[PDB]
Design an enzyme around this catalytic site. Structure first.
Site, PDB file in Angstrom:
ATOM      1  CB  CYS A  74      -0.934  -0.010   1.206  1.00  9.92           C
ATOM      2  SG  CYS A  74      -2.056   1.387   1.312  1.00  9.92           S
ATOM      3  CB  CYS A 100       1.105   1.732   4.337  1.00  6.18           C
ATOM      4  SG  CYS A 100      -0.584   1.140   4.573  1.00  6.18           S
TER       5      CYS A 100
END
EC number: 1.8.-.-
Lengths: 104, 384, 49, 114, 42
Positions: free
Chosen positions: D37, D40
């Site tokens: 991700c 993140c």
């Protein structure tokens, strides 16, 4: 595979052998080989008849991932040149007759 | 329902679109399990999963605010319909949407709510820790009385995601807003973007999304979403199939990446009468389109390796959807002409390609000029 | 045939009722005086002269 | 002799369950993340800064959703990045924040809600 | 030998030899009285 190991490796099994064949072979006058939980790596450079009265043996040929299950009361003839691995998980005792060419 | 709202006006160009849902910063909803994790602490390695991504995250989508911002940057006019709190974060989100020239007249403030905050209680059912929602966040707490009927009247396309289906209040508000939008002549754009809960099982998600699926004129799903909704194992087995002795044609010998085009017979379970356009996106590489008359695929591409240190796939699907809406609002012939449809979908392909070159979804949304330049650079002039 | 796609390069490996199976092969043009590096049916790996 | 570069510790679902069950004096901040991700990474840096700020007055932990996907789904995680602010008082209720929220927002939540 | 030994059962492609090559779908592809019947005659 599809074919059982006994047919592939040419192992004679005479499970629940009757008394007639036993007395014909003279098994009662054969010597006794004993073992407990052990592991015998052996190559049969000669034929050998084996009668199991007490104990169980699982036979694993060289390289095989399967085994031939032999119980008590079975008459087994291990063929010449067989390279198997004998396994015992309990006290074991058998009667033998090493056989040369022809003979019986 | 009964009457109209406001004063009738000829309305300015380009036609307005409405994005319904939650306004959030980043927050990709689609989450699945990936088998190639990087170092848990060293985030400098995590860019390697941006140029070798999980297939479900090849062109990730996000909140409807991303689609609205991208659509405005591509030359369109957009309005966002939703609720934020009256705290600093809600004002920051509304300011972000305002600086991007997104209409926030449809944004409802709640002075007593904390933006993007949810109250939950932690429980230990059957030996496993779990949570349950106590108070929903203001982004999931928009009421049908808080809608903006002028926006729903002017908007020609109504856009929403399946994240609102995870909230009952937002579900009821969504269906009332869809009723209002269909009354005034707008089109319903369902951009699935299945969140983490909706990947649990196929039948549960089908039952959860069937009503909104049937209320949509335009639907965009990813390849993973479509295959999950129809049958995951069947297509997984079909991809893994290899002929035993010889290939059936020369092209099968090259072991190329699979770009299987689903037949409309396979799409038949998910088709309904009011569906004018279904788009299945394999990232920016493939755009499978389905209409009641015809179907096909638009061949695209991607290159995130051209900029290994700035590439980020977040927001690429939002750019694709925004480009689709931008071309739909200004080219009505897309719904009826296949060649025009593919030519206009190449624009959305280019928009998705550019959006992968920047860190951050909002920060990297392309403009119309850059998107048209990239489209003319990538394709041969006969495909423009 | 006029109504048939062009054949690909290779050797005819299997002959059937309405189809043939081709083992793909790549021809290399060589003018007189060139030197072939290998016997017949010799295995060549990628990059070998 | 060499200090560690990261202060946020990664925990399993079982370890997090044990941590929540046990007596807690300082607020517990649980991070759900995945290495694939993009957002993140920024959240990871922000939480490292937050852990530096709250030396012993808060506990920052992270859970990978590629190892505890079912646990994350049970905890009502709808996407990434997602933070859970768990108060030391069992009577109070935890707060779930979704998105790349500012560091000052985290400070406000920790100070005035935990 | 097996005796001198110092586990427990209780507990695509086609080969081309003449040197070996594998033939598969990566290099081979496809382009394209009573009634008399085939069978044994005894």
């Amino acid at each position: 595979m599809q074919t059982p190991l006994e047919e592939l490796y040419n192992v004679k099994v005479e499970r629940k052998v009757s008394q007639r064949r036993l007395e014909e072979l003279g098994v009662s006058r054969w010597s006794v080989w004993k073992t407990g939980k052990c592991k015998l790596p052996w190559d049969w450079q000669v034929d050998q008849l084996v009668y199991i009265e007490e104990g169980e043996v699982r036979v694993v040929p060289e390289g095989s991932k399967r085994f031939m299950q032999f119980l008590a009361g079975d008459l087994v003839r291990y063929p010449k040149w067989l390279e198997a691995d004998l396994f015992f998980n309990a006290p074991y005792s058998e009667r033998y007759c090493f056989k040369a060419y022809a003979d019986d | 329902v009964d009457y109209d709202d406001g004063i009738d006006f000829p309305y300015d160009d380009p036609p307005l679109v409405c994005c319904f849902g939650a306004v959030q910063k980043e927050f990709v909803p689609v989450v699945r399990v990936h088998d190639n994790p990087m170092h848990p602490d060293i985030y400098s390695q995590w860019k390697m999963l941006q140029w070798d991504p999980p297939e479900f995250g090849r062109a990730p989508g996000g909140p409807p605010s991303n689609v609205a911002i991208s659509h405005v940057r591509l030359g369109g006019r957009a309005a966002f319909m939703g609720k934020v709190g009256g705290d600093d974060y809600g004002e920051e989100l509304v300011l972000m949407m305002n600086k991007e020239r997104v209409q926030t007249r449809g944004v409802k403030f709640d002075e007593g709510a904390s933006t993007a905050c949810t109250r939950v209680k932690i429980k230990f059912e059957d030996g496993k820790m779990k949570a349950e929602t106590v108070k929903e966040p203001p982004e999931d707490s928009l009421l049908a009385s808080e809608l903006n009927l002028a926006v729903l009247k002017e908007a020609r396309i109504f856009h929403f995601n399946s994240e609102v289906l995870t909230s009952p209040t937002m579900e009821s508000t969504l269906f009332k807003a869809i009723q209002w939008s269909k009354k005034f002549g707008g089109l319903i754009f369902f951009d699935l973007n299945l969140p983490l809960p909706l990947w649990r099982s196929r039948n549960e998600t089908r039952k959860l999304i069937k009503k909104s699926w049937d209320e949509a004129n335009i639907i965009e799903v990813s390849q993973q979403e479509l295959e999950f909704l129809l049958d995951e194992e069947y297509y997984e087995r079909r991809r893994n199939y290899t002929p035993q002795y010889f290939a059936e044609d020369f092209e099968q010998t090259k072991n190329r990446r699979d770009y299987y085009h689903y037949t409309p017979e396979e799409i038949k379970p998910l088709w309904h009468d009011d569906l004018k356009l279904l788009v299945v996106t394999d990232g920016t590489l493939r755009l499978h389109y389905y209409t009641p008359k015809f179907d096909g695929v638009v061949v695209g591409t991607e290159d995130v390796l051209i900029t290994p240190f700035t590439c980020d796939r977040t927001g690429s699907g939002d750019a694709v959807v925004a480009g689709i809406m931008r071309k739909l609002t200004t080219c009505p012939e897309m719904f009826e002409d296949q060649d025009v449809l593919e030519r206009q979908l190449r624009f959305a392909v280019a928009a998705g390609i550019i959006s992968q070159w920047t860190i951050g979804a909002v920060r990297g949304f392309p403009t119309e000029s850059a998107t048209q330049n990239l489209k003319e650079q990538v394709y041969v002039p006969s495909m423009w | 045939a006029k109504k048939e796609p062009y054949l690909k390069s290779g050797q005819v490996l299997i002959v059937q009722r309405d189809s043939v199976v081709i083992r793909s092969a790549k021809p290399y043009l060589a003018t007189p005086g060139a030197k072939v590096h290998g016997h017949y049916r010799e295995i060549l790996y990628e990059g070998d002269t | 002799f060499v200090r560690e570069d990261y202060l946020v510790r990664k925990l399993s679902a079982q370890e997090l369950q044990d941590l929540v069950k046990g007596e807690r004096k300082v607020p517990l901040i649980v991070d759900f993340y995945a290495t694939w991700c993009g957002p993140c990474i920024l959240m990871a840096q922000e939480l490292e800064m937050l852990a530096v700020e709250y030396e012993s007055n808060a506990m920052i932990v992270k859970v990978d959703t590629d190892d505890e996907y079912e646990f994350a789904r049970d905890m009502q995680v709808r996407g990434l990045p997602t933070l859970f602010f768990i108060s030391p008082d069992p009577s109070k209720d935890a707060i779930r924040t979704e998105g790349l929220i500012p560091l000052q927002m985290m400070r406000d939540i920790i100070d005035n809600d935990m | 030998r097996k005796r001198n030994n110092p586990m427990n059962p209780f507990y695509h492609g086609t080969i081309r030899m003449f040197s070996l090559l594998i033939l598969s779908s990566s290099n081979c592809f496809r382009i394209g009285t009573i009634k008399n019947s085939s069978g044994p005659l005894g």
